[PDB]
Design a protein around this nucleic acid. Structure first.
Ligand SMILES: [K+]
Ligand SMILES: [K+]
Ligand SMILES: [K+]
Ligand SMILES: [K+]
Ligand SMILES: [K+]
Ligand SMILES: [K+]
Ligand SMILES: [K+]
Ligand SMILES: [K+]
Ligand SMILES: [K+]
Ligand SMILES: [K+]
Ligand SMILES: [K+]
Ligand SMILES: [K+]
Ligand SMILES: [K+]
Ligand SMILES: [K+]
Ligand SMILES: [K+]
Ligand SMILES: [K+]
Ligand SMILES: [K+]
Ligand SMILES: [K+]
Ligand SMILES: [K+]
Ligand SMILES: [Mg+2]
Ligand SMILES: [Mg+2]
Ligand SMILES: [Mg+2]
Ligand SMILES: [Mg+2]
Ligand SMILES: [Mg+2]
Ligand SMILES: [Mg+2]
Ligand SMILES: [Mg+2]
Ligand SMILES: [Mg+2]
Ligand SMILES: [Mg+2]
Ligand SMILES: [Mg+2]
Ligand SMILES: [Mg+2]
Ligand SMILES: [Mg+2]
Ligand SMILES: [Mg+2]
Ligand SMILES: [Mg+2]
Ligand SMILES: [Mg+2]
Ligand SMILES: [Mg+2]
Ligand SMILES: [Mg+2]
Ligand SMILES: [Mg+2]
Ligand SMILES: [Mg+2]
Ligand SMILES: [Mg+2]
Ligand SMILES: [Mg+2]
Ligand SMILES: [Mg+2]
Ligand SMILES: [Mg+2]
Ligand SMILES: [Mg+2]
Ligand SMILES: [Mg+2]
Ligand SMILES: [Mg+2]
Ligand SMILES: [Mg+2]
Ligand SMILES: [Mg+2]
Ligand SMILES: [Mg+2]
Ligand SMILES: [Mg+2]
Ligand SMILES: [Mg+2]
Ligand SMILES: [Mg+2]
Ligand SMILES: [Mg+2]
Ligand SMILES: [Mg+2]
Ligand SMILES: [Mg+2]
Ligand SMILES: [Mg+2]
Ligand SMILES: [Mg+2]
Ligand SMILES: [Mg+2]
Ligand SMILES: [Mg+2]
Ligand SMILES: [Mg+2]
Ligand SMILES: [Mg+2]
Ligand SMILES: [Mg+2]
Ligand SMILES: [Mg+2]
Ligand SMILES: [Mg+2]
Ligand SMILES: [Mg+2]
Ligand SMILES: [Mg+2]
Ligand SMILES: [Mg+2]
Ligand SMILES: [Mg+2]
Ligand SMILES: [Mg+2]
Ligand SMILES: [Mg+2]
Ligand SMILES: [Mg+2]
Ligand SMILES: [Mg+2]
Ligand SMILES: [Mg+2]
Lengths: 93, 62, 77, 95, 6, 45, 6
RNA sequence: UACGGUGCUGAAGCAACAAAUGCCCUGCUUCCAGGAAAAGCCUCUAAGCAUCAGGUAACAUCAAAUCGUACCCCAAACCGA
RNA sequence: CGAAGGUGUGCUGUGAGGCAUGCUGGAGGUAUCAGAAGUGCGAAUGCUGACAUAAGUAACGAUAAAGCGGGUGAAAAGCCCGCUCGCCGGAAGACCAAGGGUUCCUGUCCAACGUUAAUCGGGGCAGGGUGAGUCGACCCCUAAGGCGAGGCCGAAAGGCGUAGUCGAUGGGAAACAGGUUAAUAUUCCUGUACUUGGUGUUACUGCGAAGGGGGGACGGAGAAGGCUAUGUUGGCCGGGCG
RNA sequence: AGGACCGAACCGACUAAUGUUGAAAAAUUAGCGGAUGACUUGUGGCUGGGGGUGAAAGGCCAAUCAAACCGGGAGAUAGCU
RNA sequence: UAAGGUGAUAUGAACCGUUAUAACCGGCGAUUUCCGAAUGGGGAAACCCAGUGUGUUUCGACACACUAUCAUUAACUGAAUCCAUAGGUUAAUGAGGCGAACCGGGGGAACUGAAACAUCUAAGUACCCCGAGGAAAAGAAAUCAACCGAGAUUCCCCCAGUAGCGGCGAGCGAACGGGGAGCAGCCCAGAGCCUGAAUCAGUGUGUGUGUUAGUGGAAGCGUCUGGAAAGGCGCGCGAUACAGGGUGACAGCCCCGUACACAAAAAUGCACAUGCUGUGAGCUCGAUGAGUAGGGCGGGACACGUGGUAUCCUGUCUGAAUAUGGGGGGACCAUCCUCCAAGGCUAAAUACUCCUGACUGACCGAUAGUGAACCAGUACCGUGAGGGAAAGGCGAAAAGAAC
């Protein structure tokens, strides 16, 4: 049991890409941007509660932010956590 | 709006918090999907959450 | 440190002076000795690091007076 | 308080439009105002065309138009019914 | 989980 | 030819890092001087 | 933990 | 076939010989210069616990987080402006 | 109705200078008499910036080496594709650690960067990309050594050190083959495994450590046998008849 | 067996040429010495400036060494240019 | 306080608001991750790993709080060792770290000068260290003076580059006394009487008075030149306001101000008035700081370098009298004068400015002025300490050049 207030903060956005699209069509895996301090257990709990789908497993990685220049002034985008959430077979988001 | 929330109880404020957080989650998904046209609603719900949490702390006492 | 527990005598600095008046920095140390003092009140020996001068102070004032002074400074034995 | 406000009929004291009148359309924190019909510039707008549009004028270059006297006036502040009002300096009338 | 403050 | 700078992040941090500086009064004086100068980067950390 | 050095 | 590549279908699939510096080998032999530590681990009991705790085995069930993971790496990405 | 500054011209004083005025400039300037000085530059191998000269000279960074056809393009010796040629092959191949940190992949752009051109790039810009119970870190354990409650010592700062506590370069559980992405894979998928721990149940039960013991736990050299990686040949199977 | 022998890796640096506004602030090329040892190498650790370390050359201690580097005394002093 | 607004580059988007919960400003609150004294343990800062207690659960977990060290006190416990003590645990309270100068203290150079150099100088400076405060320190005569007197300390001007000190070299350099700033005196070393009366502290209520947002705040037109008027010219007007800034060129009257007059729900500085809790005033009787003064030896400090060298401090060894007594008056003695050490507190005049507000300059004006007018302690350089730049200006308005 994680508190719902916590679960309502952990999922930030669906990650849109060719790889994410292929993940959903081939492997029944949604790709999410999640809070940087989100654990696999919290992401699982949140997806099952909020999307109302059975989660099989969560795989996670931290995307390191890119160094970029805006008018010859150097900056760095933020690191963010990606979750590959594999839904149980036949759940279908 | 703090007028209205001040007249609610702790449990009434706690359900309003979860209602706003759920709306905040829904808006965040829409905005991420490129579906939210009304970008201003994100700030509104965020400040509403802050208002409810401020009053919850006032009810429990500083 | 080389500090008399009774008097607070500590190393002081000064000069060696040669016949030609060459000043070289030196120290003057206290004549310190660890000594076990009989305290008849407590029925105990108390070891103090004491200058020879401090031992004459203990002889004159008595160990109980001196130890009472140490307790007021918070200097330990 | 601001002497010149949105919707005021003003008269231009200074510049190419000296003497012309218009309604204050917006009051900027720069200390400038857009007065409708006044201080027209021809912007070369990219796709788009040549567009005549109002450029902001300095607020001290316009005066409140007292329609009674038919001339530029100065504004002062009074309290009436526990509320600050503007009044024309010349005739002492509330705006 | 939330130690940040929730 | 082997040049003088042979980087090791462990040795860097142990030699010059924040905690090495904080460990001694002279290291804390380095940090005081660098704060007073207004350095963006106090240490190699 | 210790006379070996721990 | 969008000339990049996709989808499908699929035979034989053994033997002999040679063979490491790898493995048996933390071995064996031999020598003197005589070749870490500590835990995991196994075992022993102490005080204590004493029809329990705890041990053991079987089965079931759940858990195994977090961070790294791209790319270069005898080099155009590291040390040498 | 044109200040300072800039640039000409004319006049003028013994000189430093002065005056006038054309043009430029577009908002300051300042008589006189006094007052005060960051008050005068050609040198200091002066200092900073700019710009010359040598000079379109030297050089373009291994003498492993190119040739041609086609494509794209404003343009192709250099990019893409193709054929040929050459070079490395205990490496000039492959995988890593350290170190670096997006350089990775895709699209797009060619100013600058690239010792040339560049359509190309480790360059610009944008988007994408790193998936673990088993790999590694973290973690348990210690070495050298570090820190070190008390403590001992030292004008102060501090020094040393006990219990401790850190510290890998060493000791300590477990995953393999195949498939897959433009870009990750012992991490995804398929197939087949394994390890440690928590609960619960069943059966049988002396359990219990900060203590004891065992173990972990160790050198150099040499020799030989048994093997496998691996290779070669045959057989087999498919294709070939130049 | 061996501070044994020949010889790659590996460690070194005797000779020559080149290079000397270098490809390189010490190298390249051809030869050369050691190559089971007083060997060599990775990671980490310790020694600090009149101090260290030195199979000893005043060698080395971050391209700096008969007293490192940085900051300060500091505008040292300069009968000299 | 308000008709606008959602900080900047920086538009746009989607909104919010217009008579009062838009925004903005001020008071008081709330929230306030992680690192950092960093404090639960560890650590390569911004990370890794816990214990304990409560509460909660979907038994997978979740939430919250506490857990550093040292000092002091208290309780409890508890060795050798019988008492006891050391030690142990727990609780409360405090400390810790940072900060530009000024301040007190512990240590303490050398270059340099002396035309070399050692005494001496530089200098008790630089620097290191410890500690404090809004200031610190000092301070209520064992002080001077000179036979007259003064009356704590501190600071300023003189005395005076004097007297002196000095390889009598280089240099160092008083005091007495005078003029000023500012002034303030007290307590313990002890009982008794009388009582809590004096005076400052602490913590409240008022009371004014500052501060932290604000409010009102005078009076100009015509014409000429011009892209534009604030300029010229003409004629007016305000001024307890002609400080200053802005506006299309130079504005008392266009705008913001300025003089002047007002303002606080709330917090808070200060000065008083008045409770409460500590605090004890006053009088008589006393008492009167000992390993100390002084001495020998070694140093140091005094302007004073051991000198004929008083006086102060003390590392070392000694060691009085204690009011019928003792210190000082620049070797020393006598006489006389003067003061009372070995306990302590004490405002003001004085020092300083990291920082806040206002105001000023015969200060700078982009190679100047800060290193930095600008996203600068940055880029960049360096293992690191540390070093350390360059770089301002379109226009009145972007009207920043459609086609
Ligand atoms: K990978
Ligand atoms: K690597
Ligand atoms: K001119
Ligand atoms: K003048
Ligand atoms: K010159
Ligand atoms: K040339
Ligand atoms: K070319
Ligand atoms: K793992
Ligand atoms: K971990
Ligand atoms: K043939
Ligand atoms: K040295
Ligand atoms: K000297
Ligand atoms: K000299
Ligand atoms: K006019
Ligand atoms: K104006
Ligand atoms: K003005
Ligand atoms: K004495
Ligand atoms: K006397
Ligand atoms: K500068
Ligand atoms: Mg998985
Ligand atoms: Mg992972
Ligand atoms: Mg071998
Ligand atoms: Mg990889
Ligand atoms: Mg000059
Ligand atoms: Mg010149
Ligand atoms: Mg000259
Ligand atoms: Mg040149
Ligand atoms: Mg040519
Ligand atoms: Mg030539
Ligand atoms: Mg030639
Ligand atoms: Mg040539
Ligand atoms: Mg080349
Ligand atoms: Mg071209
Ligand atoms: Mg071709
Ligand atoms: Mg070529
Ligand atoms: Mg090709
Ligand atoms: Mg890049
Ligand atoms: Mg690439
Ligand atoms: Mg080019
Ligand atoms: Mg690129
Ligand atoms: Mg230690
Ligand atoms: Mg450990
Ligand atoms: Mg290791
Ligand atoms: Mg790859
Ligand atoms: Mg085989
Ligand atoms: Mg040999
Ligand atoms: Mg050598
Ligand atoms: Mg060679
Ligand atoms: Mg030989
Ligand atoms: Mg050989
Ligand atoms: Mg020699
Ligand atoms: Mg060197
Ligand atoms: Mg020297
Ligand atoms: Mg000096
Ligand atoms: Mg000089
Ligand atoms: Mg800690
Ligand atoms: Mg901690
Ligand atoms: Mg303190
Ligand atoms: Mg000299
Ligand atoms: Mg004081
Ligand atoms: Mg008298
Ligand atoms: Mg006002
Ligand atoms: Mg006014
Ligand atoms: Mg102008
Ligand atoms: Mg006395
Ligand atoms: Mg005396
Ligand atoms: Mg004495
Ligand atoms: Mg004497
Ligand atoms: Mg002396
Ligand atoms: Mg005397
Ligand atoms: Mg400058
Ligand atoms: Mg200029």
């Amino acid at each position: 049991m994680i508190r719902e207030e916590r679960l309502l903060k952990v999922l930030r956005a669906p990650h849109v890409s060719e790889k994410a699209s292929t993940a959903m069509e081939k492997s029944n895996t949604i790709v999410l941007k999640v809070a940087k301090d989100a654990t696999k257990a919290e992401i699982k709990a949140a997806v099952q509660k909020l999307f109302e789908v059975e989660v099989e497993v969560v795989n996670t990685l931290v995307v390191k932010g890119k160094v970029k220049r805006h008018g010859q002034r150097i900056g760095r985008r933020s690191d963010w956590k990606k979750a590959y959430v594999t839904l149980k077979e036949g759940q279908n988001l | 709006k703090a007028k209205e929330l001040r007249e609610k109880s702790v449990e009434e404020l706690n359900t309003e918090l979860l209602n706003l957080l759920r709306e905040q989650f829904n808006l965040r998904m829409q905005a991420a999907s490129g579906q939210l046209q009304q970008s201003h609603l994100l700030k509104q719900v965020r400040r509403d959450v802050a208002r409810v949490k401020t009053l919850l702390n006032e009810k429990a006492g500083a | 440190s080389r500090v008399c527990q009774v008097t607070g005598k500590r190393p002081v600095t000064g000069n060696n002076r040669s016949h030609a008046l060459n000043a070289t920095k030196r120290r003057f140390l206290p004549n310190l000795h660890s000594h076990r003092f009989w305290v008849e009140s407590e029925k105990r020996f108390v070891t103090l690091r004491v200058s020879a001068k401090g031992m004459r102070v203990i002889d004159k004032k008595g160990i109980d007076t001196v130890l009472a002074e140490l307790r007021a400074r918070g200097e330990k034995y | 308080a601001a002497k010149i406000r949105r919707d005021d009929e003003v008269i231009v004291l200074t510049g190419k439009d000296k003497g012309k009148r218009g309604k204050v359309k917006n009051v900027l924190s720069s200390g400038k105002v857009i007065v409708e019909g006044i201080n027209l510039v021809k912007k070369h707008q990219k796709p788009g065309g040549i567009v005549e549009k109002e450029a902001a004028i300095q607020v001290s270059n316009v005066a409140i138009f007292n329609a009674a006297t038919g001339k530029a006036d100065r504004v002062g502040f009074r309290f009436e019914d526990g509320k600050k009002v503007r009044f024309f300096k010349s005739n002492s009338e509330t705006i | 989980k939330a130690x940040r403050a929730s | 030819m082997k040049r003088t700078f042979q980087p090791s992040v462990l040795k860097r941090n142990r030699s010059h890092g924040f905690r090495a500086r904080m460990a001694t009064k002279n290291g804390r004086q380095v940090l005081a001087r660098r704060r007073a100068k207004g350095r963006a980067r106090l240490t190699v950390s």
